[PDB]
Amino acid sequence: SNLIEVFVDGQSVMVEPGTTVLQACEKVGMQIPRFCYHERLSVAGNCRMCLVEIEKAPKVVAACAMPVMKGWNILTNSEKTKKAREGVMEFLLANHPLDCPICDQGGECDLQDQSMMFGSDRSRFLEGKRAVEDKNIGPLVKTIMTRCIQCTRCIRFASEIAGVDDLGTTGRGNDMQVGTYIEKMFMSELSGNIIDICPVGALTSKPYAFTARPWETRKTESIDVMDAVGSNIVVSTRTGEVMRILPRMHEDINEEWISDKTR
Amino acid sequence: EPFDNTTYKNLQHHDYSTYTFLDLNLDLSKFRMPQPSSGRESPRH
Amino acid sequence: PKKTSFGSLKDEDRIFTNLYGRHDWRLKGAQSRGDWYKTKEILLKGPDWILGEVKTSGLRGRGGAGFPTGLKWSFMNKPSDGRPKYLVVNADEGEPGTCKDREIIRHDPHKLVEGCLVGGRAMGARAAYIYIRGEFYNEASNLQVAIREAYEAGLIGKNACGSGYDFDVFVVRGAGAYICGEETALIESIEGKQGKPRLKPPFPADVGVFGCPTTVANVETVAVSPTICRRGGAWFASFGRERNSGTKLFNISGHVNNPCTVEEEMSVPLKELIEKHAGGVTGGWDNLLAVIPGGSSTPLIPKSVCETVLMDFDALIQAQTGLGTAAVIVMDRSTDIVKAIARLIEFYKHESCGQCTPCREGVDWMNKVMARFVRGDARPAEIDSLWEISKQIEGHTICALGDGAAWPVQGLIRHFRPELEERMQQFAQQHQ
Amino acid sequence: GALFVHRDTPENNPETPFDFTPENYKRIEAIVKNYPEGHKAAAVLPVLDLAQRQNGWLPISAMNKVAEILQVPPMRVYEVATFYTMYNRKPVGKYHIQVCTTTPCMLRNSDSILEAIQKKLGIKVGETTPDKLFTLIEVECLGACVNAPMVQINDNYYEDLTPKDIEEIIDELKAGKIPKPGPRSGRFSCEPAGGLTSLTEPPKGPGFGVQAGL
Ligand SMILES: Cc1cc2nc3c(=O)[nH]c(=O)nc-3n(C[C@H](O)[C@H](O)[C@H](O)COP(=O)(O)O)c2cc1C
Ligand code: SF4
Ligand code: SF4
Ligand code: SF4
Ligand code: FES
Ligand code: FES
Ligand SMILES: [K+]
């Protein structure tokens, strides 16, 4: 075969040419941190949370973007790798606001969970924080953009999945912002799906705002009946009351998306 | 013809208007060779 | 016997013989100084021979990185696969303290346009885009005039120089961004997107501008290319030390008696270069405080090192700095060193593209810290904090702008820590 | 200041009248041909520059016009307008003065140049005069570092300025003249101020140094 052999912490694994470092680690049950990499979108490589050390190399490479070369010993838990995650996670939380109590994402937030698994336990940031103004993009997706971590998942989803080149980045530097630049409503049959991909509380469901917390909801894997596609969904209840609807991944039907009517 | 090293020979840029660069690019069109074709009118096609 | 002292470059060696614009810069003027001479005969020797001359001459990229130019341009030297191949010239002169590039297009435009043809034929390219920064409107027009003259003289276009090789040259102006000097971010602007660098791989020699193979070269490393072929690569290598050979343009600026751009030889001593051409340090050489050798992306060095350091890549690397763009910025005793470097950080903070995390959220963090150091509104325990913050940016970024913004801070903390701590004491006791 | 989100106003809104003059359209017809077919989006920067020259700034209507003629999503033109800094999204004075203030131009006392310009016009940085003749802003390195201190007005570099030298140009501009570009110190270009030190010899003729093999 054309399979190449590479080592993940010394463990041999066979991969096809052009496989990325991040995909190599999945083959052996290892999951690299990530904020910008989504398996169903473009590759952005602009969060640097997936930086990984390659043995006998002086630099740490972006696992999500870097294709793997033959006989690379990937060190997913070396000291250099650990200090790359700690450094990056320190920059994300520098200007992030203290909204966890009043943030809808709280309890199911990738910034929160990966902070406690890969980041430090305190902060050495003494300066003031950046503050961005909200942007109205419709009656479904609420925007509180001070929490955006400029990952571009929303930008890449709308352009490629929903085919609506209406979201983008404006400015540059620490002031770079994500939005429409004008009073525009992101109204598409797949509009609600940007809520899920957004790893933080910048985008959240507006109808669902403030009603429940992730840990107190019971999940029921059911089917959608709003159309003939039969999208797999997870119905969330709390005290016998339906609270929200989430996609349930199925490769052959709906990938991991659902339409606004279902959602 | 005599060599004089005490005078500035770059004196044409004191009177460039606001469309000089574009006009020169326009004038350099008939000389250009035909461009290659990607095969589609745009990546959105 | 190879020499051990460098400098005193004889004018018959200086490649840029119209550096100061004291002679006609048009085609007739250029053709009276060896430009566009036997250019055809160079082309018909083949791409390998042209690269062999550059490869043997020991040339290194003059844009700041300093990689070997012969090896780089050899990546293009592979048979096509159904796509164009392009040579992109980086004239986005935006590095602070650097003005050498502005003096080549404006005064020796034809020498560059001769380089494109020589370089383009070497790489097998079909046309050259020249990226000239937006603020250089007048310089771009001069370059445009030269291109038209060459087009009407048969020196480019269809059947260039009579050699049967077609080669077009286009000049595209940037709309204003220091980051657009980066080789990949420069490619994005040509494509019409924002100027945000790409990750690597792929390298531009695989997927460059418009997705076709592309080589990005600085104006200086491309202007001298025809002369290397004409005068032989052996002649070029004779200057500078081994693996540092050639002549370099230098911009001496700041606290010097006579700031100037002068062409000299590689490995020239810094003290000799300043005193010989720049008229010495203002107030006498003992007034020297620090020097930034290669523009601003390189760490500064204190006076004690400036008295014996040669101007080349390896010697400056041995001094915990880098040759960079060879743009010497001099600072004297009257200079407030903290504020002077606190301003460089405030430059990168504005020029940061913002795409990736460390430089987007971290260069602003360093900028906010350095502002407090200027007033002394800090404590000594934060100096090591800023050192550690800088090393989290360096090497963790998409492009080198993040690397180039950490190094200025490290230099200041490395060689001038007492001034930082001295400043904080005064603020502490005053506000008491 | 300098927000990055557009809001509709009576004088700046998508119904504002803008259109390239037919002479500009001919120029655009040649800009688009510098790029391969199917990659016509590469003309966004030059076309946005051309519109700014016609109008002096970019209203929201101008950006949409560039998008319409190049078949580009409107948001992809708003990204470019806010990214590069030479695109003026708010009206500017008749003369946009831009005082460099980076370290090389700071070491040579640009602050005095900046202070002098404010005093002559009585406007703070970033402001425009009541008559809409001048707009003053600080900028980063402009590439004329050896000729510091210096400013740029519209398209020209005035170099080696001193507080008296700059105030002359403003007076010349306020009279409707076209002040000469280039340094105002006694030198012409990047050459040393105190007499040359290199190239003080006639340039060698064609064929000098050509190796025998070639
Ligand atoms: C932030 C940044 C700014 C840069 N600006 C320039 C520039 O203005 N001119 C230049 O020739 N190279 C510049 N470079 C270096 C280019 O990326 C690239 O290394 C070089 O232009 C390639 O040509 P070379 O072979 O001569 O090095 C810059 C790099 C960075 C990271
Ligand atoms: S996005 Fe996550 S980390 Fe930020 S406030 Fe919300 S829950 Fe907390
Ligand atoms: S809004 Fe959310 S998905 Fe979009 S860039 Fe910001 S963090 Fe990423
Ligand atoms: S280091 Fe800064 S300038 Fe370079 S790609 Fe990252 S954010 Fe952009
Ligand atoms: S997940 Fe790789 S850089 Fe974002
Ligand atoms: S520092 Fe002002 S022009 Fe370079
Ligand atoms: K979310």
Side-chain angles (χ1 to χ4, degrees):
Chain A
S1 293
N2 58 90
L3 295 177
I4 54 173
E5 172 174 344
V6 299
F7 299 103
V8 177
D9 296 326
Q11 177 174 3
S12 178
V13 50
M14 311 299 296
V15 294
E16 298 130 33
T19 294
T20 70
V21 172
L22 177 140
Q23 291 183 343
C25 301
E26 297 174 357
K27 305 267 286 185
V28 306
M30 167 63 188
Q31 195 191 6
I32 305 291
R34 64 204 64 174
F35 288 108
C36 82
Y37 171 83
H38 200 268
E39 56 278 2
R40 294 180 202 283
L41 299 176
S42 300
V43 185
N46 63 41
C47 85
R48 320 305 293 172
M49 185 57 185
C50 80
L51 298 176
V52 85
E53 179 205 345
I54 299 292
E55 193 180 33
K56 295 190 303 303
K59 198 192 188 69
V60 301
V61 310
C64 63
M66 181 69 74
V68 195
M69 301 198 69
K70 178 178 184 59
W72 263 8
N73 198 4
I74 299 161
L75 300 173
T76 62
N77 191 262
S78 67
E79 273 283 347
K80 193 202 297 300
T81 291
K82 291 207 244 63
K83 304 177 79 172
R85 297 169 188 155
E86 291 195 15
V88 174
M89 187 64 51
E90 197 184 27
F91 291 132
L92 292 177
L93 303 178
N95 295 286
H96 198 84
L98 282 64
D99 289 352
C100 289
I102 58 171
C103 184
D104 260 325
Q105 197 72 25
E108 57 189 350
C109 170
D110 273 1
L111 188 57
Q112 252 182 341
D113 284 9
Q114 289 183 98
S115 172
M116 277 213 64
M117 263 45 162
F118 308 106
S120 192
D121 57 332
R122 59 204 59 192
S123 93
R124 52 179 177 179
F125 176 84
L126 306 172
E127 322 310 335
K129 289 179 175 295
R130 155 171 55 90
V132 181
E133 60 165 10
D134 307 8
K135 323 188 191 305
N136 180 88
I137 53 170
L140 294 177
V141 191
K142 165 155 58 58
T143 61
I144 298 174
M145 302 303 299
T146 311
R147 305 165 188 166
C148 173
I149 57 177
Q150 286 83 14
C151 86
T152 62
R153 290 252 267 273
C154 58
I155 294 162
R156 289 176 288 153
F157 172 92
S159 177
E160 306 162 11
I161 306 296
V164 186
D165 302 310
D166 293 357
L167 291 172
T169 40
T170 59
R172 64 168 144 92
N174 185 78
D175 192 89
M176 189 188 71
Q177 296 191 24
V178 174
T180 54
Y181 183 72
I182 61 183
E183 305 295 354
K184 170 166 287 305
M185 326 184 68
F186 181 59
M187 291 280 90
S188 177
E189 69 288 316
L190 309 178
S191 158
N193 286 287
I194 64 181
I195 287 164
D196 299 317
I197 61 186
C198 186
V200 284
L203 309 176
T204 44
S205 175
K206 190 172 290 182
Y208 176 79
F210 306 165
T211 60
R213 277 292 191 208
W215 57 83
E216 65 182 18
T217 61
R218 301 165 180 269
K219 297 86 187 176
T220 297
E221 307 192 356
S222 170
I223 295 287
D224 150 76
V225 303
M226 291 298 99
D227 62 328
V229 180
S231 303
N232 290 22
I233 72 187
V234 160
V235 185
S236 299
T237 72
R238 184 200 65 183
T239 56
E241 180 182 357
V242 178
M243 305 304 288
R244 58 137 85 106
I245 302 280
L246 291 173
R248 183 163 56 100
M249 195 203 75
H250 196 294
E251 295 282 23
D252 291 327
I253 301 175
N254 60 313
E255 294 286 359
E256 51 175 287
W257 320 127
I258 60 188
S259 65
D260 277 357
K261 203 192 317 193
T262 298
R263 180 181 290 264
Chain B
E1 202 171 29
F3 169 61
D4 183 14
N5 196 3
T6 63
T7 65
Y8 204 63
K9 305 299 178 61
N10 166 35
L11 297 171
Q12 307 79 345
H13 79 265
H14 301 338
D15 53 75
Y16 280 152
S17 55
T18 187
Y19 281 96
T20 298
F21 180 88
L22 290 301
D23 292 320
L24 285 166
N25 180 85
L26 170 55
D27 292 357
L28 291 168
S29 57
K30 56 207 182 62
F31 301 103
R32 314 292 200 182
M33 294 220 67
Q35 301 291 337
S37 186
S38 170
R40 64 179 77 268
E41 191 172 351
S42 62
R44 285 138 56 80
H45 291 59
Chain C
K2 45 78 232 64
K3 297 155 285 187
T4 181
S5 180
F6 305 90
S8 292
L9 188 70
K10 285 145 65 279
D11 288 7
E12 49 266 22
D13 306 321
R14 286 181 173 79
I15 298 188
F16 298 97
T17 65
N18 188 359
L19 182 61
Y20 305 101
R22 297 287 179 84
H23 328 114
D24 176 78
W25 56 267
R26 278 79 147 289
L27 179 58
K28 47 130 287 180
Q31 284 180 326
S32 56
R33 304 193 305 276
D35 310 359
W36 289 111
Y37 178 80
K38 281 188 179 306
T39 317
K40 181 201 286 68
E41 292 72 10
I42 300 168
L43 297 173
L44 304 182
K45 275 292 191 303
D48 284 62
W49 187 88
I50 296 176
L51 295 175
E53 292 296 300
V54 169
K55 190 181 293 181
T56 186
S57 71
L59 186 69
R60 316 228 310 191
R62 308 289 170 187
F67 299 161
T69 306
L71 279 55
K72 174 186 288 204
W73 300 8
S74 305
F75 296 120
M76 301 282 280
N77 184 23
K78 80 299 187 65
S80 306
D81 69 71
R83 302 182 297 181
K85 291 170 67 180
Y86 284 102
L87 158 57
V88 174
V89 180
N90 186 316
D92 186 307
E93 184 58 288
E95 183 72 29
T98 312
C99 63
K100 58 180 187 62
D101 301 350
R102 181 196 174 195
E103 309 295 313
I104 289 171
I105 61 189
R106 185 179 58 170
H107 290 145
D108 261 317
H110 280 264
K111 202 174 293 305
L112 170 51
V113 181
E114 183 190 359
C116 301
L117 188 66
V118 172
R121 204 290 95 94
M123 308 166 185
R126 67 113 66 195
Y129 293 97
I130 307 181
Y131 198 101
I132 175 57
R133 88 202 296 264
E135 290 87 344
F136 291 171
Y137 181 83
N138 296 333
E139 293 74 3
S141 301
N142 279 15
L143 180 53
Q144 279 287 14
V145 171
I147 294 170
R148 179 172 59 176
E149 290 181 329
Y151 267 110
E152 300 173 345
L155 295 167
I156 57 176
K158 197 177 183 298
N159 182 278
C161 288
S163 64
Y165 181 63
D166 302 339
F167 198 77
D168 293 303
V169 180
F170 307 86
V171 173
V172 306
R173 291 177 49 254
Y178 162 68
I179 178 58
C180 287
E182 212 281 5
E183 64 181 4
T184 53
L186 169 151
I187 288 171
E188 306 294 9
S189 295
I190 299 179
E191 291 187 346
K193 300 183 295 191
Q194 299 173 106
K196 291 182 167 179
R198 306 175 175 177
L199 287 73
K200 293 179 284 294
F203 305 98
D206 311 327
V207 185
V209 75
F210 312 118
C212 305
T214 307
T215 291
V216 185
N218 175 250
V219 177
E220 183 176 2
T221 179
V222 177
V224 304
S225 169
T227 303
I228 287 175
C229 303
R230 270 202 284 271
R231 300 199 63 179
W235 158 79
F236 191 78
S238 311
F239 309 98
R241 298 199 314 181
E242 195 264 12
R243 283 165 295 98
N244 302 332
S245 71
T247 51
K248 184 67 180 65
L249 291 164
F250 293 91
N251 312 282
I252 300 79
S253 56
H255 290 143
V256 285
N257 286 326
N258 293 335
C260 63
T261 292
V262 57
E263 172 170 0
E264 259 291 9
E265 183 176 28
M266 286 290 285
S267 305
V268 59
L270 181 52
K271 190 176 182 292
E272 176 174 340
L273 179 68
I274 299 169
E275 297 183 358
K276 188 177 295 183
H277 302 280
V281 183
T282 292
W285 174 267
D286 305 76
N287 207 34
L288 186 69
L289 169 52
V291 181
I292 306 172
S296 60
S297 311
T298 55
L300 55 67
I301 55 172
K303 168 172 171 293
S304 67
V305 182
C306 294
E307 287 175 330
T308 312
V309 75
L310 313 186
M311 292 297 300
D312 74 338
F313 295 106
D314 309 342
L316 287 173
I317 286 173
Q318 197 65 8
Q320 293 166 324
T321 184
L323 174 54
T325 58
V328 182
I329 301 171
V330 172
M331 290 177 280
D332 59 358
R333 294 297 185 88
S334 64
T335 300
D336 183 359
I337 194 67
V338 184
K339 194 173 79 69
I341 304 301
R343 187 66 186 75
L344 289 175
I345 306 306
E346 178 171 358
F347 164 79
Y348 289 103
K349 159 171 169 292
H350 288 173
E351 303 297 348
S352 156
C353 95
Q355 172 177 216
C356 80
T357 280
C359 152
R360 184 192 56 257
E361 303 299 338
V363 169
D364 181 54
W365 191 354
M366 293 199 300
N367 178 86
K368 289 199 180 80
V369 169
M370 291 302 301
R372 283 187 303 100
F373 285 3
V374 166
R375 319 194 318 269
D377 188 5
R379 49 187 161 180
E382 300 188 17
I383 291 164
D384 286 320
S385 168
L386 182 55
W387 180 268
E388 283 195 338
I389 290 165
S390 78
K391 307 243 70 179
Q392 298 181 165
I393 304 168
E394 179 190 335
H396 297 49
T397 55
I398 293 174
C399 89
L401 195 161
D403 298 13
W407 293 335
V409 180
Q410 297 169 6
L412 176 64
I413 296 168
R414 186 188 297 113
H415 291 291
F416 293 88
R417 185 160 187 164
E419 177 56 42
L420 299 165
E421 302 180 356
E422 184 68 9
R423 189 80 62 84
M424 301 165 190
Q425 298 173 9
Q426 192 201 6
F427 177 96
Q429 64 107 332
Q430 283 175 321
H431 299 52
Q432 194 68 285
Chain D
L3 305 175
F4 295 103
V5 305
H6 168 65
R7 266 178 292 282
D8 277 328
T9 55
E11 57 168 320
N12 181 13
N13 65 92
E15 295 74 1
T16 301
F18 172 89
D19 190 10
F20 300 102
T21 72
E23 287 64 18
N24 288 327
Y25 266 105
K26 277 171 64 180
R27 296 181 173 95
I28 299 168
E29 205 244 8
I31 293 172
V32 174
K33 287 189 295 191
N34 298 351
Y35 309 95
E37 304 181 27
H39 294 279
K40 172 162 59 173
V44 170
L45 279 65
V47 172
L48 256 183
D49 183 17
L50 188 53
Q52 185 187 341
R53 293 191 172 279
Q54 178 172 330
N55 231 47
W57 70 304
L58 292 170
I60 187 57
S61 57
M63 302 178 187
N64 306 280
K65 180 90 290 197
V66 181
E68 188 209 337
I69 66 129
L70 285 161
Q71 288 94 53
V72 182
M75 182 61 191
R76 299 287 170 268
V77 174
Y78 308 164
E79 293 185 358
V80 180
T82 58
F83 190 94
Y84 305 90
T85 35
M86 301 200 316
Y87 293 128
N88 298 315
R89 293 175 298 108
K90 280 170 69 282
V92 295
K94 197 182 192 301
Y95 297 107
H96 199 188
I97 293 166
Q98 306 165 9
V99 182
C100 183
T101 55
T102 314
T103 290
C105 283
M106 185 177 68
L107 296 181
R108 296 202 141 267
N109 180 247
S110 58
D111 180 59
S112 59
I113 304 307
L114 185 66
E115 289 288 331
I117 296 170
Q118 290 177 218
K119 192 181 68 56
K120 187 63 167 61
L121 293 170
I123 62 176
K124 315 174 190 300
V125 177
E127 301 180 344
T128 305
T129 55
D131 49 5
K132 307 297 187 301
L133 270 287
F134 299 96
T135 305
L136 179 64
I137 69 172
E138 294 172 347
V139 300
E140 305 300 330
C141 180
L142 302 178
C145 313
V146 300
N147 300 282
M150 48 78 66
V151 310
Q152 186 183 232
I153 312 186
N154 289 125
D155 294 324
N156 300 336
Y157 277 8
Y158 309 105
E159 329 179 0
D160 307 358
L161 306 178
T162 221
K164 176 51 171 286
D165 314 325
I166 184 60
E167 288 196 36
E168 295 184 12
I169 309 183
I170 301 179
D171 295 332
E172 293 183 17
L173 293 170
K174 292 172 68 170
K177 313 179 187 296
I178 301 88
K180 210 95 300 186
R184 311 286 191 82
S185 65
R187 53 112 81 92
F188 308 153
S189 70
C190 57
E191 68 271 320
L196 284 178
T197 64
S198 59
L199 303 178
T200 50
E201 196 178 12
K204 277 60 185 71
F208 188 97
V210 180
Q211 56 189 318
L214 199 178

